[PDB]
Structure 1
Amino acid sequence: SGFRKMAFPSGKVEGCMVQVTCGTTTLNGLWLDDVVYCPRHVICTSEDMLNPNYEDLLIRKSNHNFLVQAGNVQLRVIGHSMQNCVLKLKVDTANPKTPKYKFVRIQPGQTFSVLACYNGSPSGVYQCAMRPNFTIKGSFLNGSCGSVGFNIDYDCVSFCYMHHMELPTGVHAGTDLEGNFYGPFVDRQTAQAAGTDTTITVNVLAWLYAAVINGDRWFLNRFTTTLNDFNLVAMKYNYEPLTQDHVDILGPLSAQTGIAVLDMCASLKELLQNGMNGRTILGSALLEDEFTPFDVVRQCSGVT
């Protein structure tokens, strides 16, 4: 029993982290097979960062200008290319610690683990959600760029996120491992606003199921409701609209707990209209939305 914001074990990713230096700028890269992936803003000087022409900047750069260090050993760079906002550095050695892996572009509301790194060295691991507005609420300092988000399915690491920047609001913006930004963000030092950040309704409901499972049931009420009625209340509180896809994904938790999704929606409705009255759920004084239904099933069943 108990419920924790739990990250994937980070070992398979720790073996993939390198330091990439171009000119004076150092950040993190991901060494998989004989390719090192890093943010392309590695090639920028703080004066380029305002309005960079990445094509023109990269033209000034040769294989040998890219210093790739794995722990204390240097990698030989035999090729470089830009794909969207990532640089791919062809090295002459396959990373011997390359896990089975995939590149996946995650959907907003989905969760992943972040291995925050500095100078190619792992410092810590936490669990994140892709906000509906395609930002993450991370913990990233200077040099953390190139730090990656991932999920693990048994032996396979699905890389979904590479850290590129902090917006002036202190939220975090980044790419998939094909270097396409999540959201409308560009890799340029300019004022960029994220949309309205909504609450991930299906995740909050999943967490309410986690709570009931773990003995926190005070918020269970005598009421039920309808998708349309629930979504009237979701609208008011900047919650994501609940669809039948969400209901379907909650079915395993519905089944285990014997609490119908729409009854739990009515619990959530009352919680939104009435607040928590100084009570807590799983040691939280607000509605948690960074657990997917999948995360609750995994944690509450014991998937390794």
Structure 2
Amino acid sequence: SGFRKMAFPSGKVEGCMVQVTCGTTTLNGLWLDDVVYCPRHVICTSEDMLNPNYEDLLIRKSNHNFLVQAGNVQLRVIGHSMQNCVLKLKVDTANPKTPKYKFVRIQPGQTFSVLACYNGSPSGVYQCAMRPNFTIKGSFLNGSCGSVGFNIDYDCVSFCYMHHMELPTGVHAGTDLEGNFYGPFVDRQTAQAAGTDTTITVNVLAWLYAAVINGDRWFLNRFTTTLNDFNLVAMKYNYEPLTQDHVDILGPLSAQTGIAVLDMCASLKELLQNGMNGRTILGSALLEDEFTPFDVVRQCSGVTF
């Protein structure tokens, strides 16, 4: 019993974290095989950040301008290239701790674990979701750039996020490991803002199923609804639309608890229109949207890595 915001075990990723220094800036790099990946903004000064020409700034750097430290060992940089907003530093040593990995680009609503790092040293691990507005509500201080997000699917680490920046509202923006930003953000010191965010409906439903599995049923009711009627309610309360794909994905949880997806939608509809009336669900007074249907099944079944 119990339901916690749970991150994947971070060990496989900890063995990949390195410190990357370029001039006065120190941030984190991800060392996989003989390549260290890091945000391309490591090469910028504060003035360069105002309007950077990364190709021009990079052509002025030599391999020896990048100092890479793996623990207390300096790696020698033997090549450098840029792929979108990520810098790839070729090193002379393949990381002996390189796990089985893939680079995956996730969709809004998908969750992942973040291994927050400073000076190439892991400091903490937490779970978060890619918001519908493409930001992540992370916890990052100066020096955290290059920290990564990931999932583990069997014995394979799927890297999905690299930290690049903090927006003025305190939320975060980054890229996939191919350097493509999530959201309409750019790696430049210019006016940028997170768009209006919405609630990840399928994840709220998954969390309500987790609450039922954990013995919290007060919010259940005799009613059902249609996908069309529920989507009118979802739009009204700034909830993401629920698709037939989301309904299908929630099938297993619906079968286990005996509550149809549209039956759970009628519980959610009532919660949106009336609130919790002083009650809580899984120790929360808010509807939680950072657990996917897969996270709920995984946690409630004890899948290991």
TM-score range for the pair, normalised by the shorter chain length = over 0.9
**Percent pairwise identity:** 100
The answer (yes or no) to whether the contact 1:101–1:156 under 8 Å persists in 2 is yes
Per-residue deviation, 1:190 = 1.1
The C-alpha deviation readout for 1:97-119, integer Å capped at 9, x for no partner, is: 00000000001000000000000
CA distance in 2, matches of 1:7, 1:30: 19
| TM-aligned CA deviation for residue 47 of structure 1 | 1.2
Q: Give a deviation string over 1:223-277, Cα, whole Å, max 9, x none.
A: 1111111011100100001110000000000010011100000000000000111
* 1:256 equivalent in alignment to 2:262: no
Q: What is the DSSP-based 3-state SS (H/G/I as helix, E as strand, rest coil) of the residue aligned with 1:161?
A: strand
Query: 1:84 maps to what in 2?
Result: 84
Residues 165-219 of structure 1, C-alpha deviation per residue, up to 9 Å, x if partnerless? 0001110000000000001100001111222211000000000000000000100
CA distance in 2, matches of 1:119, 1:26: 7
Asked if structure 2 preserves the Cα contact closer than 8 Å seen for 1:221 and 1:267, the reply is yes
Q: Distance in 2 between matches of 1:225 and 1:49?
A: 51
CA distance in 2: counterparts of 1:58 and 1:117, whole angstroms = 24
SS in 2 for 1:108: coil
User: Partner residue of 2:35?
Assistant: 35
* Misfit runs of 4+, over 2 Å: none
Q: Structure 2 stretches of 5 or more lacking a match?
A: none
Aligned to 1:170: 170
**SS of residue paired to 1:265:** helix
1:150 is the counterpart of 2:150: yes
Deviation per CA, 1:27-46: give whole Å up to 9, x if none.
Answer: 00000000000000000011
Distance 2:80 2:110 in 1: 32
The offset of 1:154, in angstroms, is 2.3
The root-mean-square deviation of aligned C-alpha atoms, in Å, is 0.5
The 2-side partners of 1:14 and 1:193 are apart by: 31
Cα distance in 2, alignment partners of residues 133 and 153 from structure 1: 25
Give secondary structure in 1 for the equivalent of 2:49.
coil
Gaps of 5+ in 1: none
CA distance in 2 between counterparts of 1:4 and 1:240 reads 24
Q: Matched residues in 2 for 1:53 and 1:102: separation?
A: 29
**In the aligned structure 2, how far is the partner of 1:122 from the partner of 1:142?**
14
Could you say which residue in structure 1 is the equivalent of 2:183? 183
User: Which deviations, in whole Å up to 9, do the C-alpha atoms of 1:76-107 show, x marking residues without a partner?
Assistant: 11100000000000001000000000000001
Contact 1:167 1:191 in 2 (8 A): no
1:155 Cα deviation after fit: 1.4
Structure 2 CA distance for aligned equivalents of residues 125 and 193 of structure 1: 26
**In 2, are the aligned partners of 1:103 and 1:160 still within 8 Å (CA)?**
yes
CA distance, structure 2, for counterparts of residue 223 and residue 302 of structure 1: 32
Aligned-partner SS, 2:190: coil
- Pairwise CA distance, 1:145: 0.2
1:103-143 deviations in whole A, cap 9, x for unaligned? 00001000000000000000000000000111000000000
Q: Give the Cα–Cα distance (whole angstroms) in 1 for the partners of residues 47 and 195 of structure 2.
A: 28
With normalisation by structure 2, the TM-score equals: 0.99
Question: How many residues are paired up?
Answer: 304
TM-score, normalised via structure 1 length: 0.99
Tell me, yes or no, if the aligned pair for 1:49 and 1:189 is still in contact at 8 Å.
yes
